[PDB]
Design a protein around this ligand. Structure first.
Ligand SMILES: CCCN(C)C(=O)CCCCCCCCCS[C@@H]1Cc2cc(O)ccc2[C@H]2CC[C@]3(C)[C@@H](O)CC[C@H]3[C@@H]21
Ligand SMILES: CCCN(C)C(=O)CCCCCCCCCS[C@@H]1Cc2cc(O)ccc2[C@H]2CC[C@]3(C)[C@@H](O)CC[C@H]3[C@@H]21
Lengths: 235, 239
């Protein structure tokens, strides 16, 4: 069923699955002063919706529950970050963590080590802006992250695991076909399609890098979702 | 200006040598010392290779240093994974230093990283990665890994970033040219392109884990400094 979709059906499926944009929970009539608490509460609530989204990525629920957990455990911070960079794209110099929580780099200075991470995310959003990234390409990229980030770290060679990895790579191939279809439908030449495909996928390496830095930042001060919590939520 | 075949030839011709580990092979078999000493010597040849990547020496010295500082561990790792491709279960750090995962257990925290490198090597084997594709990917890592972290918007920096992306576009054309000449269909071409580039995200992840391991081992002194990279890159032309 998953591998059956056309490119337009894949795009429609991914667009329909998009999670909502959440708001930060602070009293807006109360003075602003808490930063780490605001950001981690927001990511808390986003995670529940991320799982709903992931279950709607075609092919994802065809995997074992264990492999769904592994994929999400590996990708969750990358997925939060690409979403942040996407909605920050039209706010140069600012990160739209939430519509009521738009921060510039000086506001990241209030937590040691955070402005460095703010700077990388702002630069990624400028790269998105520079490339005129489209919403349809964005949902493809976010789905690629979900399927790709953990696929090389199963460290299992059971027959089931071979079939799982094969399936994941088949879905990833369909998403590649879909990105190419979208750039063809936008008028790009074949050369430009291959070049833009590459430019988009290379950005995913930097998003991986930012996630690793962000994980180190977190670890340097139970904020990380445990396997068991992810398992319970995915059930 | 290069054609695809000329890009391939340039990169193949620039390949660094394969170095040996320096340990007396007639003495009993230090693990971190062996691996540190090898990477230290590979770095010098990495600089030589980088200067031969088309477009690289057209950048400012500062930007050359930034790219190498950002990419150096990824470049060592992709080389290791390529060398290990035909040795299932083993990592050929050097022809005289072929280690399995149990030998990684001697350094706390190292077997986790060995497992990731072995799985990447298995992935290369499953994709039947070719030598011409490998050199393309390694050059992409050099050009891509630090291009998003210049943290500069001077006119010169905009020109540098534009140039890097033009060279990266050229390597993309070359990868597609290689798979077209291998007979792959257009659908297969963009699928293989994507599979190869997505492996570069995992190589980035492994480098982050490896840096973190180097720092936790208190082997931070082993990371090449900005000054050291600058000193080796800022060559005179008196020789
Ligand atoms: C015991 C009771 C309390 N519990 C159980 C909890 O609170 C649950 C905690 C477990 C689930 C997830 C919490 C951690 C996620 C917080 S990331 C935090 C919020 C966030 C939201 C987004 O859209 C995009 C990115 C980010 C992050 C970008 C990288 C940052 C900037 C880092 O540099 C430091 C903060 C990071 C931000
Ligand atoms: C300070 C002032 C100026 N100076 C003097 C300097 O900067 C000196 C800096 C000289 C650079 C020396 C580099 C040492 C880096 C050692 S990587 C070490 C050797 C190596 C060689 C390869 O082919 C491929 C991968 C690796 C690595 C894969 C990840 C490992 C397994 C980690 O898990 C722990 C060891 C890592 C390995």
């Amino acid at each position: 069923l998953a591998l059956s979709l056309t490119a337009d059906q894949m795009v429609s499926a991914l667009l329909d699955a998009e999670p909502p944009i959440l708001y930060s929970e602070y009293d807006p009539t109360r003075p602003f002063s808490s930063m780490m608490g605001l950001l981690t509460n927001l990511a808390d609530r986003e995670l529940v919706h991320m799982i709903n989204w992931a279950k709607r990525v075609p092919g994802f629920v065809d995997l074992t529950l264990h492999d769904q957990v592994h994929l999400l455990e590996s990708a969750w911070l990358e997925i939060l970050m690409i979403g942040l960079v996407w909605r920050s794209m039209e706010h140069p110099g600012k990160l739209l963590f939430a519509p009521n929580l738009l921060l510039d780099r000086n506001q990241g200075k209030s937590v040691e080590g955070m402005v460095e991470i703010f700077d990388m995310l702002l630069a990624t959003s400028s790269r998105f802006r520079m490339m005129n990234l489209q919403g349809e390409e964005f949902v493809c990229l976010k789905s690629i992250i979900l399927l790709n980030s953990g696929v090389y770290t199963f460290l299992s060679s059971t027959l089931k695991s071979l079939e799982e990895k094969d399936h994941i790579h088949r879905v990833l191939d369909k998403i590649t076909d879909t990105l190419i279809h979208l750039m063809a439908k936008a008028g790009l030449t074949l050369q430009q399609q291959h070049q833009r495909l590459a430019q988009l996928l290379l950005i995913l390496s930097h998003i991986r890098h930012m996630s690793n830095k962000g994980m180190e930042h977190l670890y340097s001060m139970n904020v990380v979702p445990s396997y068991d919590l992810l398992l319970e939520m995915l059930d």
